[PDB]
Design a protein around this ligand. Structure first.
Ligand code: DH7
Length: 279
């Protein structure tokens, strides 16, 4: 166990801590690719939770790395991750701009006001997850064209959207609603009310209307999975398929707003089999 290794293993710990689904999937990659993904997840995880002196530190470390990839830096933030990322950046191409978007997006959240329109919601989704998918693109593809970044973005955005959908109650508890004012009003939904009195027909419909957007985006990515390298395809199929499965979970929980639903490891394993079986 070198020193890099320990850094990467911390990264890995973080990812497995916070995303049982993506770990499950992405741990099935070649060693080189799965390490890179650990580093990037961790950096992003670190920014998402960073909340404000830490976040500028993380931005500064990343600017360092981008300017002078092959210098030693005294990282202000988390040194274990920045080394792991710096190591990646030496061998692979990192969309630094996408990190800066995510960072920007996370600033703006300290004064979160509700989105006026779906457009704003989809634009948050980009900043929060579309950005991640872009950062990962060079890792999961042999040759990176515009439609490679496009797909991975679309996947990223839809997964974030599936997040929102699972997390509706929890998010309300933390004084956040991600459904847009225009869509709430059109569908006649008061999220405060549903939280108290259970679900109804108007909620289900709004929730089902977003769900439709996700499933559709998921399908659109499956039919373009080829843009990713051959080892990564079934991995990315898996990750996505597990995450759509989250939607049927919420349905069986009757769209509850008083627990995180989950896809038990056995189901995860079932799906790896279905997907693996046709590769
Ligand atoms: C938790 C989970 C997921 C979490 C988050 C996700 C996302 C943020 C997707 C979008 C983000 C992407 C592409 C990059 C990540 C980095 C940032 C967005 C900064 C599913 C697995 C279940 C767990 C770990 C236990 C939870 C308990 C239950 C399900 C009962």
């Amino acid at each position: 166990m070198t020193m890099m290794d320990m850094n990467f293993k911390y990264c890995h710990k973080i990812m497995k801590k916070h995303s049982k689904s993506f770990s499950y999937a992405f741990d099935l990659l070649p060693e080189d690719q799965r390490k890179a993904v650990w580093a990037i997840y961790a950096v992003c995880r670190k920014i998402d939770d960073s909340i404000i002196q830490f976040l500028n530190q993380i931005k500064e470390d990343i600017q360092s790395i981008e300017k002078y990839p092959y210098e030693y830096h005294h990282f202000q933030s988390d040194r274990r991750i920045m080394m792991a990322l710096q190591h990646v950046a030496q061998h692979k191409n990192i969309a630094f701009q996408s990190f800066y978007n995510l960072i920007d997006t996370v600033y703006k959240d300290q004064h979160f006001t509700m989105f006026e329109t779906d457009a704003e919601l989809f634009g948050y989704c980009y900043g929060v997850a579309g950005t991640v998918g872009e950062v990962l693109t060079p890792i999961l593809s042999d040759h990176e064209t515009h439609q490679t970044y496009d797909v991975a973005r679309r996947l990223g955005e839809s997964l974030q959207l599936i997040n929102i959908l699972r997390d509706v109650g929890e998010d309300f508890e933390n004084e956040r609603i991600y459904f847009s004012k225009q869509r709430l009003k059109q569908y006649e939904v008061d999220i405060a009310e549903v939280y108290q009195n259970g679900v109804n027909n108007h909620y289900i419909d709004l929730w089902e209307y977003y769900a439709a957007i996700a499933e559709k985006d998921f399908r659109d990515v499956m039919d373009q999975i080829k843009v990713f390298s051959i080892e990564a395809q079934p991995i990315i199929e898996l990750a996505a398929r597990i995450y759509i499965e989250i939607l049927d979970e919420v349905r069986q929980a009757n769209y509850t707003l008083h627990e995180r639903v989950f896809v038990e490891k056995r189901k995860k394993a079932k799906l790896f089999h279905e997907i693996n079986s046709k590769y």
